[PDB]
Amino acid sequence: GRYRIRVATGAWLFSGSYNRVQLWLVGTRGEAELELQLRPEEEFDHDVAEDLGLLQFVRLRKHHWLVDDAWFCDRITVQGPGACAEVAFPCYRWVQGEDILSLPEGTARLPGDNALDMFQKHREKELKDRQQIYCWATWKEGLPLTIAADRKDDLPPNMRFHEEKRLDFEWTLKAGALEMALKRVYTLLSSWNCLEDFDQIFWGQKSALAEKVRQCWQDDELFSYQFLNGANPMLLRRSTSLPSRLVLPSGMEELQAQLEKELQNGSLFEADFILLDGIPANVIRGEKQYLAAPLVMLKMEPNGKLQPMVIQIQPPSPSSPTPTLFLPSDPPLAWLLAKSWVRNSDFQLHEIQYHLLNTHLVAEVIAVATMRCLPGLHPIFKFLIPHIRYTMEINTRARTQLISDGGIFDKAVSTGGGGHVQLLRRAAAQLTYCSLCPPDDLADRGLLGLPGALYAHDALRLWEIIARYVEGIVHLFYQRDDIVKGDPELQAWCREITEVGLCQAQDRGFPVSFQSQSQLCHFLTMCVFTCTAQHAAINQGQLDWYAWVPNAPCTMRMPPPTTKEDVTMATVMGSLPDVRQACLQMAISWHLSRRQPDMVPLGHHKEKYFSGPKPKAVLNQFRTDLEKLEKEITARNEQLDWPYEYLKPSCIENSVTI
Ligand SMILES: [Fe+2]
């Protein structure tokens, strides 16, 4: 009866040289008392005369510790006597207090009807404790619920930032600050009267693709290319009909004929920003910002490059029944101002609807429900816990520093001061289940089969690879549909996302319960895609496309133009952001777009929550398929002048952390 124990430690903070942890090896028929000393993997050897049987649980106490001492245990692996296999006890949890921390055996188990089973009692007790430590909160009415944490110190310690991630976050904030200080110094006395004056702040936090954006932002093909493969590829859709808001002033017969012939051809595309209609604009430092709800109509040329046809910056109103329609054949300053207005509103719906709401808040809902309703034994929890890492802290820091009342979003973006909350309320109703699934989303938007849509191709490839991973894990643990229906914790998690997390999203196509393996697989695929790939698609293009502020303004300081002949250089430069708003846009884009040094790639989580070999085989197949997709995307991007790099699996983070 010789037991060999390995204790894995991820992080620790020890005042003394060694610390004392009391250990129990709880089996089916008995338990063994242990004496180990933490010197942080490390190994301990011990013999027990009593026969323990099949080892099931490992219990922990921090024995006589100081209040500043903390310990992040990773996994305890116990090699039993004989030629038996190594038995794994995944923890990946900070150990709080002096109480018993029971670590079940690593084989992921669905709950059963046997209430006297010790795994069932443990998962019920863990669910009760984790429900009373992870709680929902209503940040704003009409929005999906957050974690009950006003600040980052109110968060549970198990999902706090680690030391390297928090120090990187604070260093990047100090970097952005020092940069915008060295830019206020540089551009305090400099004039702001031409588009080349934005080069005075376009330095430092930039890339090669951002430099290409600066060189070619006034080209209409690049402005159209941002709708398909820019920072916001989530808004362009194919027109099945002409929009009702596109009210053509008479004398524009030509344009109507062109729109009709390419609508019946099928090459007509629209990017309707009508969600911003009626949103009150921010007032920054006593200066009133301005908003619009544009509609740009795009044509799919046979060469594979989109081209624009008409920009209607403001929708029709009772005051102005026919708005000014801006064409590329206009005076160039008016067309440039219309394009800048469209790109401004693309920044608005990009950062608010498709980044903050579609990815960050949805992944927060997934994280809170995955904690609250899925216990540590449960296989879907082990599936989702690498994909929900650091999401609650980044969303709490966003709600505290970024999108708060009196925050950065209100000091730089045109929707700040409460208009972004109203836009979030509008977009939360438009947050459908099909919109978060790129097969359904790009089928609704008509972007399937489009050759120039590299985001669509990479999103379908990532969806099928992630769906293969999801189907492998689910078919490992849910062999039948009644097994999916017979899991009360899984349906509780589904209701905690849909009824509770997303504020009764039954009307938006989200499932209230899982009735099949396929439905659970589709929902887990969209959860993992929202947590990793959609966030990488919508979060990495900020520096490449938004560094050049005239390419995509955060705000506009002048009303949209109604006469094309009155648009001069002063009108364009007074409509564009000024030095503070532009520098703050660049700093937030760099801070919320850069590659973290603590970036866990997609599928490459070093934490082993599963213990059986078959989930490791499914994860290895996931990594192999992602490596093949990385090779394919690299081979495609080497032949492209404007490559789409944001959905490379080496550049896709394993969770929404930034
Ligand atoms: Fe983000």
Side-chain angles (χ1 to χ4, degrees):
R2 182 66 60 84
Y3 277 85
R4 174 154 264 270
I5 303 148
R6 157 182 284 101
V7 173
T9 293
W12 71 95
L13 184 64
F14 287 166
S15 72
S17 178
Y18 87 108
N19 290 75
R20 180 67 177 87
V21 167
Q22 187 175 181
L23 196 83
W24 285 267
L25 298 179
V26 186
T28 52
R29 68 181 65 252
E31 65 185 3
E33 191 73 87
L34 270 295
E35 179 178 358
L36 60 88
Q37 296 198 1
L38 283 200
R39 288 186 177 88
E41 323 296 330
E42 65 183 1
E43 276 269 352
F44 314 93
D45 200 4
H46 182 74
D47 63 351
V48 178
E50 186 178 1
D51 169 55
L52 282 71
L54 182 63
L55 191 64
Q56 289 188 326
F57 282 86
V58 162
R59 310 209 206 114
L60 277 69
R61 294 180 66 250
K62 305 192 313 184
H63 182 74
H64 295 327
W65 283 33
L66 308 179
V67 296
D68 290 359
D69 280 358
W71 174 38
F72 190 84
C73 174
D74 281 359
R75 72 192 311 239
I76 291 161
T77 78
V78 182
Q79 298 84 320
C84 54
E86 184 171 7
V87 176
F89 299 103
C91 178
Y92 308 113
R93 185 171 295 107
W94 290 95
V95 188
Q96 285 70 240
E98 300 278 319
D99 63 341
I100 290 288
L101 182 63
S102 291
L103 308 180
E105 197 262 326
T107 301
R109 297 166 176 86
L110 296 180
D113 219 347
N114 290 319
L116 276 297
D117 180 49
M118 188 66 204
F119 289 116
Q120 189 67 41
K121 306 198 272 222
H122 178 272
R123 72 195 309 142
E124 275 153 15
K125 180 180 62 69
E126 183 178 1
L127 273 191
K128 275 151 208 163
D129 300 345
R130 183 144 83 199
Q131 276 169 13
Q132 67 182 357
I133 192 167
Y134 291 90
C135 304
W136 293 105
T138 306
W139 175 56
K140 296 293 187 180
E141 68 275 15
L143 289 180
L145 306 189
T146 79
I147 187 67
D150 304 5
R151 63 181 293 166
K152 63 192 182 55
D153 286 87
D154 263 358
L155 280 154
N158 290 324
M159 293 178 70
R160 283 303 305 275
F161 277 177
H162 283 87
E163 175 95 9
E164 57 270 2
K165 170 80 171 181
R166 181 180 52 79
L167 266 295
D168 183 72
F169 208 96
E170 294 171 6
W171 178 84
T172 46
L173 293 175
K174 287 190 285 290
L178 175 67
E179 177 204 55
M180 293 183 285
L182 296 198
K183 273 168 189 181
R184 182 188 169 95
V185 162
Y186 187 64
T187 46
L188 194 61
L189 301 183
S190 178
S191 196
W192 218 250
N193 77 94
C194 82
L195 276 299
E196 292 83 3
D197 279 3
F198 273 91
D199 281 335
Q200 298 160 8
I201 65 153
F202 190 67
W203 55 266
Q205 305 164 343
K206 72 175 164 184
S207 63
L209 194 81
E211 182 68 30
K212 287 181 60 64
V213 160
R214 186 264 178 275
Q215 295 298 110
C216 303
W217 70 287
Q218 281 182 74
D219 205 15
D220 290 4
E221 65 182 1
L222 184 63
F223 159 75
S224 310
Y225 177 83
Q226 313 201 63
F227 294 114
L228 268 189
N229 314 272
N232 188 19
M234 294 299 291
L235 198 151
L236 182 65
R237 55 175 49 241
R238 192 190 301 264
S239 307
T240 56
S241 303
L242 282 182
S244 68
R245 55 163 298 178
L246 192 61
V247 174
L248 261 73
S250 177
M252 271 179 207
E253 185 279 335
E254 174 186 300
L255 177 74
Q256 179 73 30
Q258 293 179 356
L259 283 163
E260 285 290 328
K261 65 92 176 179
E262 90 183 25
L263 176 61
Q264 63 85 30
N265 175 227
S267 47
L268 176 57
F269 288 81
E270 61 152 359
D272 203 353
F273 313 91
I274 195 65
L275 201 65
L276 272 172
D277 187 29
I279 297 289
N282 203 19
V283 176
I284 303 176
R285 286 161 269 210
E287 164 193 63
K288 169 73 169 66
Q289 309 301 294
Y290 290 90
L291 273 164
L295 165 79
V296 54
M297 298 300 291
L298 279 299
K299 63 182 181 292
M300 198 68 240
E301 303 269 38
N303 47 56
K305 295 299 285 192
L306 272 168
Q307 283 287 322
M309 293 179 70
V310 58
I311 286 180
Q312 187 198 61
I313 312 182
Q314 292 271 34
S317 63
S319 68
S320 70
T322 182
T324 310
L325 289 190
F326 290 85
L327 314 165
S329 51
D330 285 333
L333 288 175
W335 171 244
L336 176 65
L337 195 50
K339 283 191 302 175
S340 290
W341 267 105
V342 167
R343 293 287 328 140
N344 176 231
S345 299
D346 203 0
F347 185 89
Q348 306 310 307
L349 281 74
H350 165 242
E351 304 287 359
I352 292 171
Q353 169 170 32
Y354 297 121
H355 182 187
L356 175 63
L357 180 87
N358 275 31
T359 71
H360 270 251
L361 296 191
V362 174
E364 182 172 32
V365 162
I366 290 156
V368 174
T370 309
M371 293 316 253
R372 279 185 57 87
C373 297
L374 295 178
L377 268 159
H378 191 273
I380 307 303
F381 166 77
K382 295 180 172 176
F383 191 75
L384 288 164
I385 193 61
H387 304 307
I388 63 172
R389 186 186 82 141
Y390 297 157
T391 310
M392 307 207 199
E393 185 156 354
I394 191 61
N395 282 47
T396 315
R397 288 176 176 252
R399 278 183 301 274
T400 300
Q401 313 286 339
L402 183 63
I403 63 191
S404 49
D405 291 334
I408 303 171
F409 216 75
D410 304 1
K411 296 305 187 56
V413 195
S414 57
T415 51
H420 68 292
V421 174
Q422 180 172 354
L423 192 60
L424 276 161
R425 287 196 275 262
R426 291 180 177 220
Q430 188 173 355
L431 192 134
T432 58
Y433 181 63
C434 55
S435 69
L436 293 181
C437 306
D440 308 309
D441 165 59
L442 297 156
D444 291 331
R445 294 200 281 136
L447 303 194
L448 257 67
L450 213 55
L454 310 172
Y455 160 73
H457 171 266
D458 293 331
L460 272 295
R461 289 277 289 114
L462 274 155
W463 180 267
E464 70 184 4
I465 285 168
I466 283 168
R468 191 169 314 119
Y469 180 39
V470 167
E471 278 157 43
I473 291 297
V474 165
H475 289 71
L476 275 179
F477 291 101
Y478 296 91
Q479 286 88 0
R480 295 179 66 251
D481 288 349
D482 291 331
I483 298 170
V484 189
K485 289 188 260 189
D487 191 358
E489 293 162 351
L490 191 70
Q491 315 303 321
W493 171 76
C494 189
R495 293 178 293 173
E496 205 87 4
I497 287 189
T498 306
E499 292 291 330
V500 182
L502 295 179
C503 294
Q504 292 87 1
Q506 278 75 231
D507 52 84
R508 288 167 278 154
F510 285 89
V512 60
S513 70
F514 297 132
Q515 306 300 115
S516 68
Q517 285 179 69
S518 296
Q519 189 177 21
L520 164 69
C521 280
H522 204 264
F523 195 81
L524 277 174
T525 310
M526 61 80 70
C527 286
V528 174
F529 206 101
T530 305
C531 286
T532 74
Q534 189 54 234
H535 175 251
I538 212 72
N539 179 68
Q540 299 309 122
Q542 313 188 241
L543 183 61
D544 291 357
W545 298 97
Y546 294 171
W548 189 239
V549 187
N551 174 57
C554 56
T555 176
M556 308 284 285
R557 304 175 297 129
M558 199 155 307
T562 61
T563 298
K564 318 164 183 195
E565 294 293 328
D566 284 325
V567 184
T568 59
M569 185 34 67
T571 302
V572 177
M573 281 296 289
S575 295
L576 279 193
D578 55 2
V579 186
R580 292 293 86 194
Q581 295 157 349
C583 288
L584 197 48
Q585 169 186 338
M586 293 178 70
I588 299 299
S589 62
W590 168 84
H591 175 74
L592 300 186
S593 74
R594 67 182 288 277
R595 185 195 188 277
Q596 270 74 77
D598 201 3
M599 183 180 73
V600 175
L602 171 56
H604 287 84
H605 39 272
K606 300 288 96 176
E607 294 84 3
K608 293 182 183 293
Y609 287 87
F610 292 103
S611 175
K614 310 150 76 53
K616 320 286 207 62
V618 172
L619 182 54
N620 283 28
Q621 192 54 238
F622 184 46
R623 292 164 174 172
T624 294
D625 293 347
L626 288 170
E627 189 46 59
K628 186 183 287 185
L629 181 53
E630 168 90 28
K631 285 193 273 273
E632 292 179 353
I633 290 176
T634 309
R636 179 207 64 198
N637 281 349
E638 283 291 326
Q639 309 297 343
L640 290 162
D641 292 331
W642 285 96
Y644 193 81
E645 300 288 330
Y646 314 117
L647 284 194
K648 298 200 299 183
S650 65
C651 282
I652 289 161
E653 195 157 7
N654 211 32
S655 44
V656 182
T657 65
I658 196 56

